[PDB]
Amino acid sequence: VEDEPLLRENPRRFVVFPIEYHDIWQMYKKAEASFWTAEEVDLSKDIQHWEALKPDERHFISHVLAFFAASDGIVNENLVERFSQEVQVTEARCFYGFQIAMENIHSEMYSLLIDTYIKDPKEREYLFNAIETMPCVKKKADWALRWIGDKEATYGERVVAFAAVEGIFFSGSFASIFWLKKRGLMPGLTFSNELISRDEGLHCDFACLMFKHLVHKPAEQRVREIITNAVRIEQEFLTEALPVKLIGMNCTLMKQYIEFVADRLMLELGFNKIFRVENPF
Amino acid sequence: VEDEPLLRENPRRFVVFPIEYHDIWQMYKKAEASFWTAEEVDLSKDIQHWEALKPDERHFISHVLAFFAASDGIVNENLVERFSQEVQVTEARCFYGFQIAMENIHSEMYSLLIDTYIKDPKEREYLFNAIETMPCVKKKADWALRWIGDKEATYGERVVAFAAVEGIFFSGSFASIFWLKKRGLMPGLTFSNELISRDEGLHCDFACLMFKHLVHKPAEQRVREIITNAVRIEQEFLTEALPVKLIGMNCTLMKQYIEFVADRLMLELGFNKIFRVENPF
Ligand SMILES: [Fe+2]
Ligand SMILES: [Fe+2]
Ligand SMILES: [Fe+2]
Ligand SMILES: [Fe+2]
C-alpha cells in the first residue's frame, strides 16, 4: 500500500493548498457546486398525484422507494468506515466528505417521499425496514454490505464494487422514474430523482477516477465479473422481484438499459464494453 | 458501550425517518441551513489591505493563519476515523457528515487566505507546514492528534477534548480577528472569520449535546482538568508564543476572555463555571 499514491502516508494531508491533484479537485468542485437540500423539493402538489395513480403504479413506486430508503445510508456507511479513512489525498477526502453529506440529503429526501405518500404508519415501517422485510431489496443490500465488511477485498475491487452499486443498482429505478416523468406524473418524485441522479453520476465518475489513480488494481476479468454480477442482480430485481411492467415498461428493454449502463461504467474504467448494446430509452 | 443509546448497535441506522432524536436533528438542520462555500468570500479587495498593515500586524495574522491551515483538517481526521464511526444514531451521523464537509470548506478558506496574502512561495511552505515548522502551533496540534490516537480515552473524554479544541483553541484567534474588524482592516479575513465562527459555535454546542446523551461520562473534575489544560495551552499561545500585543491588544484581557469561553463551555456541559470571569471584549 506504500507504493499507492492514493493510500500512502501523507504529511500534508491536513492542508488544502497547494493542490496536488487537479483532476480530483475539479470533481470535488463540481460536487460542491451541485449542493441542494431536501427542502428545495416541493412535495405539496404531490399527494394528489399519488392518488391519480393505479394500484400497480403505487405498488411499484413504493417498492422502489423502499430500496432507496436505506441505500444511501449503506453507501455512507462504507464511505465513513472505509474509503474516507483509507484515502490520504486531501482532494479525495474533500470529495468524499461532500459525498457523505449529499448521501444523507438523499436519504432524507427518500424518507420525506415515503412519509408524504404513505400516510398509514403500518405501511411505513414495512418500507422503512425494507432490508429487514422485503427479501427482494434485502439481496441488493447484503451485496453492498458484504463489500463493506470484506477485509480481504482490496481497495481496487471495493471501489469497483461501489461504483456498481451507485451506477448499476441505481440505474433501473432511475430509468423507471424518468419514464413516469415522460408520462407526466409525480412531479415531486421525478424532480428529486433528477437531482439525485446528477449526484450519482458524479459519485460514479469519481469512483472511476479513484480507480485510475490506483496502481495495482484488479485484472479486467475480475472487474467484468463484479460488474456482471451487479447487472444480473439489478435485472432480477426489475424483471422478476418488481417488474417494470407495472408502470407500462417492457421488461426486455429495461434489461438492455442496465447493460448499456454497465458498458458506460466499463469505458469510464478504461476497459472495453461487455454487452455492446445501445441505450433503448 | 451497549447501554449507551448513542453508541449501541442500531438496525434502523441507515434510514432517516422516523426521527428518534429531534434535538440532534434540529442541530443538523441549523448546520445545513448555514452552508456556504469559500467562493462566496470576496478577497479581491484584500491584497491592498494586507499592504496597509504594519510588519507586526502581518506577523501576527500570518501566524494565526498558520495554525488555522491544518486545524480543520485535524478535526475532520477525528470525525472520520472516530466520532462518525462510533455514533450509531442517524441524526448524529448526519450532523457529523455536515461538520466534515464544512471543515473542509474552512480548510480551503484558510489556504485561500494564505495564498492570497503571501505571494512568496518560500513563506507559504513555512506556514502551510506549520505543524512541522512552527513549534508554537505544533503543541496545539499534538494535543489534538493525541486525542485521536488515544485508544484508552472514552468517547466521553474525547468528545470533551474536541469541544475544547473547537471552542477554546479557536477562541483566542477568533477574538483577535474580531478586534481587527472593529479597527476596520482585512475585510476578507474578518468576513470569513464570521462565517467560520458561526460554524464552530455550532460544532461546539453539538459536542455538548452529544456529551449530554452519554450515560457513563467522565467525572466533573476530569472535565475541568481537560478544559483547564486547553485554557493554559491557548493562553500560552496568545500571550507568549504569539502576543496579541502585536495588534494592539492587552495580553491580560485576552487570557480572561479565554477563561470566559471555557466557562461558557462548562455551563453548556451542565457543570459550574471554573474561572467565574466576565467577557472583557
Ligand atoms: Fe445517493
Ligand atoms: Fe451516491
Ligand atoms: Fe472549522
Ligand atoms: Fe469545527
> Which of B81, B89, B83, B93 lies closest to B8 in space, CA to CA?
B89
The secondary structure of chain A as a DSSP string is -TT-TTTS--TTTT--PSPS-HHHHHHHHHHHHT---GGGS--GGGHHHHHTS-HHHHHHHHHHHHHHHHHHHHHHHHIIIIIHHH---HHHHHHHHHHHHHHHHHHHHHHHHHHHH---HHHHHHHHTGGGT-HHHHHHHHHHHHHHH-SSS-HHHHHHHHHHHHHHHHHHHHHHHHHHHHT---HHHHHHHHHHHHHHHHHHHHHHHHHHT-SS---HHHHHHHHHHHHHHHHHIIIIIS-GGGGT--HHHHHHHHHHHHHHHHHHHTS--SS------
Please name the residues in contact with B144: beta carbons below 8 A apart, sequence gap of 6 or more.
Answer: B71, B74, B75, B78, B161, B162, B165, B169
> Which of B111, B153, B62 lies closest to A25 in space, CA to CA?
B111
> Which of A147, A154, A153, A224 lies closest to A4 in space, CA to CA?
A154
Helix axes A135-149, A155-182, angle to 10 degrees: 150
**Cα–Cα distance for residue pair A141/A73, rounded to 1 Å:** 11
Residue B13 to residue A73, Cβ atoms within 8 A: yes
C-alpha cell at B269: 456541559
Q: What is the 3-state secondary structure (H, E, C) of chain B?
A: CCCCCCCCCCCCCCCCCCCCCHHHHHHHHHHHHCCCCHHHCCCHHHHHHHHCCCHHHHHHHHHHHHHHHHHHHHHHHHHHHHHHHHCCCHHHHHHHHHHHHHHHHHHHHHHHHHHHHCCCHHHHHHHHCHHHCCHHHHHHHHHHHHHHHCCCCCHHHHHHHHHHHHHHHHHHHHHHHHHHHHCCCCHHHHHHHHHHHHHHHHHHHHHHHHHHCCCCCCCHHHHHHHHHHHHHHHHHHHHHHCCHHHHCCCHHHHHHHHHHHHHHHHHHHCCCCCCCCCCCC
> Which of B89, B79, B68, B9 lies closest to B192 in space, CA to CA?
B68
Residue B61 in contact with residue B68, Cβ under 8 Å?
no
C-alpha cell at B262: 471555557
* Residue among A11, A13, A111 whose CB faces B16 most closely: A111
**Cα–Cα distance for residue pair B92/B84, rounded to 1 Å:** 8
Length of chain A: 281
C-alpha cell at B112: 485561500
**Cα–Cα distance for residue pair B219/B217, rounded to 1 Å:** 7
Measured in whole angstroms, the distance separating CA A209 from the mean position of its chain's CA atoms is: 16
**Cα–Cα distance for residue pair B176/B249, rounded to 1 Å:** 8
Residues of A classed as catalytic: 110
**Cα–Cα distance for residue pair A38/A192, rounded to 1 Å:** 8
Q: Which of A10, A12, A16, A85 best probes binding to B when mutated, by most B CB atoms within 10 angstroms?
A: A16
Please name the method used to determine this structure.
X-ray
Residue A17 to residue B114, Cβ atoms within 8 A: yes
Residue B222 in contact with residue B206, Cβ under 8 Å?
no
**Cα–Cα distance for residue pair B158/B164, rounded to 1 Å:** 10
Q: Cα dist. B207→B200, B204, B275 in Å? A: 10, 5, 21
Residue A128 in contact with residue A111, Cβ under 8 Å?
yes
Residue A73 to residue B115, Cβ atoms within 8 A: no
> Which of A65, A48, A100, A131 lies closest to A206 in space, CA to CA?
A100
CA B201 – ligand 4 centroid, Å: 8
* Residue among A35, A97, A132 whose CB faces B35 most closely: A35
CA B167 – ligand 4 centroid, Å: 8
Residue B166 in contact with residue B207, Cβ under 8 Å?
yes
Nearest CA in chain A to B93: A104
Q: How far is A14 from chain B (nearest CA, A)?
A: 4
Q: Cα dist. B73→A88, A140, B76, B112, B121 in Å? A: 11, 35, 5, 15, 21
Nearest CA in chain B to A114: B17
**Cα–Cα distance for residue pair B3/A17, rounded to 1 Å:** 43
Q: In the block, which residue shows the cell 493510500? A: A7
- Where does residue A242 fall: left (phi above 0), alpha (psi -120 to 50 degrees), or beta otherwise? beta
Q: Which of B104, B124, B127 best probes binding to A when mutated, by most A CB atoms within 10 angstroms?
A: B104
A72 appears as a binding residue in the annotation: yes
Q: In the block, which residue shows the cell 436519504? A: A107
**Cα–Cα distance for residue pair A128/A250, rounded to 1 Å:** 28
Residue A97 to residue B107, Cβ atoms within 8 A: no
Query: Looking at the domain covering B1-281, what would its CATH class be?
Result: mainly alpha
User: For chain A, which residues make up each domain, given as ranges?
Assistant: 1-281
Q: Which amino acid is at B58?
A: R
Q: Cα dist. A75→A155, A212, A229 in Å? A: 15, 21, 18
Resolution, in Å, please?
Answer: 2.2
- Where does residue A26 fall: left (phi above 0), alpha (psi -120 to 50 degrees), or beta otherwise? alpha
Residue B166 in contact with residue B264, Cβ under 8 Å?
no
Q: Which amino acid is at B181?
A: K
Phi, psi (5° rounding) for residue A120? -70, 120
Length of chain B: 281
**Cα–Cα distance for residue pair B58/B113, rounded to 1 Å:** 13
C-alpha cell at A242: 418488481
Report CA torsion sign: B5, B9, B13, B18: negative
Residues of B classed as catalytic: 110
The secondary structure of A67-112 as a DSSP string is HHHHHHHHHHHHIIIIIHHH---HHHHHHHHHHHHHHHHHHHHHHH
CA A166 – ligand 2 centroid, Å: 5
CA A102 – ligand 3 centroid, Å: 19
Q: Which amino acid is at B209?
A: L
> Which of B159, B138, B135, B139 lies closest to B147 in space, CA to CA?
B159
Residue B213 in contact with residue B229, Cβ under 8 Å?
no
**Cα–Cα distance for residue pair A114/A265, rounded to 1 Å:** 30
Q: In the block, which residue shows the cell 432480477? A: A236
Residue A111 in contact with residue A32, Cβ under 8 Å?
no
> Which of B211, B213, B265 lies closest to B234 in space, CA to CA?
B265
* Residue among B15, B71, B107 whose CB faces A128 most closely: B15
Measured in whole angstroms, the distance separating CA A90 from the mean position of its chain's CA atoms is: 23
Neighbours of B127 (CB within 10 A): 24
Which residues does chain A have within 8 Å of residue B114's beta carbon, measured at their own beta carbons? 17
C-alpha cell at A119: 400516510
B103 appears as a binding residue in the annotation: yes
